[PDB]
Amino acid sequence: GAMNSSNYAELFNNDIKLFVDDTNVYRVTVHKTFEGNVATKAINGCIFTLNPKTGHLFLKIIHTSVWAGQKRLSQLAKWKTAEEVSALVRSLPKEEQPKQIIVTRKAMLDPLEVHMLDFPNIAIRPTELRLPFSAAMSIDKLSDVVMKATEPQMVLFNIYDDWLDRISSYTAFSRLTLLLRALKTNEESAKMILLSDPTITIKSYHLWPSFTDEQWITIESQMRDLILTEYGRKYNV
Amino acid sequence: MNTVPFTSAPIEVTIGIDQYSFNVKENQPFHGIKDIPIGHVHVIHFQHADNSSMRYGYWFDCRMGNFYIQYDPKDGLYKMMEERDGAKFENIVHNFKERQMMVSYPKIDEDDTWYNLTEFVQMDKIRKIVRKDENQFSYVDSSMTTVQENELSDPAHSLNYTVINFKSREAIRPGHEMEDFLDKSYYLNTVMLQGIFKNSSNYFGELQFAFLNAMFFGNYGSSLQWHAMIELICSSATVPKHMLDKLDEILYYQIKTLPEQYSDILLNERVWNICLYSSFQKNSLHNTEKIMENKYPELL
Numbered sequence A: 001g002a003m004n005s006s007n008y009a010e011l012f013n014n015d016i017k018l019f020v021d022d023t024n025v026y027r028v029t030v031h032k033t034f035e036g037n038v039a040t041k042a043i044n045g046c047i048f049t050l051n052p053k054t055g056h057l058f059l060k061i062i063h064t065s066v067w068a069g070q071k072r073l074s075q076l077a078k079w080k081t082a083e084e085v086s087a088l089v090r091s092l093p094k095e096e097q098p099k100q101i102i103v104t105r106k107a108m109l110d111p112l113e114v115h116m117l118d119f120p121n122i123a124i125r126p127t128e129l130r131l132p133f134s135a136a137m138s139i140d141k142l143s144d145v146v147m148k149a150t151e152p153q154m155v156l157f158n159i160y161d162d163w164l165d166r167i168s169s170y171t172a173f174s175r176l177t178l179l180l181r182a183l184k185t186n187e188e189s190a191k192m193i194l195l196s197d198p199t200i201t202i203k204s205y206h207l208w209p210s211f212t213d214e215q216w217i218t219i220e221s222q223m224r225d226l227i228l229t230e231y232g233r234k235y236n237v
Numbered sequence B: 001m002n003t004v005p006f007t008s009a010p011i012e013v014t015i016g017i018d019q020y021s022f023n024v025k026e027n028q029p030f031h032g033i034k035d036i037p038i039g040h041v042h043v044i045h046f047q048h049a050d051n052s053s054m055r056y057g058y059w060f061d062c063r064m065g066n067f068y069i070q071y072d073p074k075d076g077l078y079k080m081m082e083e084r085d086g087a088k089f090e091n092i093v094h095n096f097k098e099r100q101m102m103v104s105y106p107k108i109d110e111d112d113t114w115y116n117l118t119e120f121v122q123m124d125k126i127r128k129i130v131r132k133d134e135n136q137f138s139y140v141d142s143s144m145t146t147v148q149e150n151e152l153s154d155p156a157h158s159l160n161y162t163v164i165n166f167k168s169r170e171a172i173r174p175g176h177e178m179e180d181f182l183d184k185s186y187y188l189n190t191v192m193l194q195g196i197f198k199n200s201s202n203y204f205g206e207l208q209f210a211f212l213n214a215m216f217f218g219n220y221g222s223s224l225q226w227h228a229m230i231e232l233i234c235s236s237a238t239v240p241k242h243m244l245d246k247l248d249e250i251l252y253y254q255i256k257t258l259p260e261q262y263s264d265i266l267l268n269e270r271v272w273n274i275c276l277y278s279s280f281q282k283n284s285l286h287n288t289e290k291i292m293e294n295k296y297p298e299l300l
C-alpha cells in the first residue's frame, strides 16, 4: 500500500522502483492585465522521476507548448505526467522496468494507474512522507536546462553525483532529502551554505559541490541548523 | 391471475411476494398466494423466523409454468418446484382456493410500483445471469457472490452480472486514457450498450434486477452492480436523452420503495453525491434528486 516511516528501507532493496513527483510539471507566473484583471503565463516545467537506489533522475522537461489550447491545466498536468511516465517505462527493456512506482501526491494515483493498465505487474503506490522534491528547481543546473528548453526533452542526471562510491544509497538519499528540505525552507540561506567556500567547486558533470567526507559533515550540520532555525523564525520558538 | 400454491408451511417464516411481505406461523394452514398479476416477473422470498440469516427466494414468470412451493426438511428451505401435470395442479389449486387457504396478492389498482420497478426485467435474461438451466425459475440469496467478486468461490452458484470496471482496458481506449476515464461515454455507449446489452432496455433490465436483489436479499454484490451501472451513465457526458429521462424514473421508484431504515447500507454516499451534484448528469435527474433530497438529506 502506502510508503511511510515504517517501510523506509524498502527504497534501497534490489527491486527496481521510481519516485514520481509532479509538483513542477505545471508552473505559472500570475500577472495583471491592462484591464486590471489577473492572468497566468505558463513557464517550462518538469517531471521529477527518480530511482532512489541508483540516483538516476529522468528529468522530462515539460515545454509550455504542451498547454497550448488546453483547458483545466492543473488536471491535464497529472495525466500528462502519467502519459510521460508510462512512455518511459515502455521505452525501457523489461528487466529495466520498475516493479513499483511511488507517486508523491495522491492525485497522481488514478492517472498513473490508468496509463499503466498494460503493466498490471507494476504497483502504483502513494506515500505518507512529505518529501521535498518540489525543491528540485532550486538546483541551478536543473532549473537552467528546464528554462532553456525550446521543445519537449528528456534529460538524464544522477542526483547523487558520485556519492555512491563512498556511501550507501540510504545515506545518499538522506543527504539529498536534507539538502532539498533546506532549499525549500530558505533557498537563499541553503544556497549561501553550499557555495560559500569558492575553493569547493561543482564538477561540470555534477549537480552539487565536490565536498570531502568531512566537509559534507559540516555542510549537513549547517543544513540542519537552517531547518531548525527557520522552524523557529516561522513558529517563534 | 396466477397462483403459487404451497404444500404446507412447516416452519415459521416471513414470506415476501414482490414488495409485499407477511408472516406465517409454524404449521399455520397456509397454502400459497393467489391473484398474482400476469405479465410481470415476480419474486417470492423467505426469511425464517429462527434464523434471520439467509434471505432467499425465487424469480419467476407464471407464463412459463405452474410453480408450487414445498418445504424440504433435508435442505431446510422452502423450494420452488414445477408441476408439469397441469390438471393435478389446477385441481390442487382449486381445492385450496375453495377452502380460502391462500393470501391474495394485494395490488392496489392505482399502484404501478411493481411495474415501475420491473419494466425492463425479463425472465429469459435473468436465466442467463442466474445459471441453473433445468429450472424455469431462478434462486437467489443474500450470500451469493458475483462473477466479478470471485475474481477479487463456487462458480455454479454465482450472479453473472455484466463485469463493469472503470480502471480496465475494456473501459479505456489506448491513447484516450484521460478522455475515457473522465468521460465514460465510449464505455457506456460503444462497449456496453452497442456491444453487450444491444439496447438500453437490456442495461435498464440488469440495473433493475441488481437493485431488487440488493434490496430484497441484502446481496452486497447486487448493490455494487446497481451503483456501478448508475455511475457509468452519470459519468458519461453523452447519453441519449431518452435514456436519461428513463433512468430518472427508474431511480425515482427504487428510491421511493427502499425501506427507510435500510438506506444506511443500500445507498452509497459517494456514488449518489457524485451522480447528483458533480457528474455530467447532475442536472438530468430532477425527479430522483428531489426524492433523494426530501427523503434522505442526511446521506448528502
Ligand SMILES: COCCNC(=O)c1cncc(Br)c1
Pocket (backbone or CB within 6 Å): B005, B006, B007, B068, B069, B083, B088, B089, B092, B093
Ligand atoms: C407427482 O406429484 C408430486 C408433486 N406435486 C405436488 O406435490 C403438487 C403440485 N402442484 C401444486 C402443489 Br402445492 C403440489
Ligand SMILES: COCCNC(=O)c1cncc(Br)c1
Pocket (backbone or CB within 6 Å): B120, B121, B122, B125, B126, B128, B129, B162, B196, B197, B201, B202, B203, B204, B205, B206, B207, B209, B210
Ligand atoms: C447479456 O447478459 C445476460 C443479461 N443481459 C441483459 O440484457 C439483461 C436484461 N435484463 C435483465 C437482466 Br438480469 C439482464
Ligand SMILES: COCCNC(=O)c1cncc(Br)c1
Pocket (backbone or CB within 6 Å): B214, B215, B218, B219, B220, B221, B223, B264, B265, B266
Ligand atoms: C456494514 O456493512 C458492511 C457491508 N456494507 C454494505 O453496505 C452492504 C453489505 N451487505 C449487503 C448490502 Br445490500 C450492503
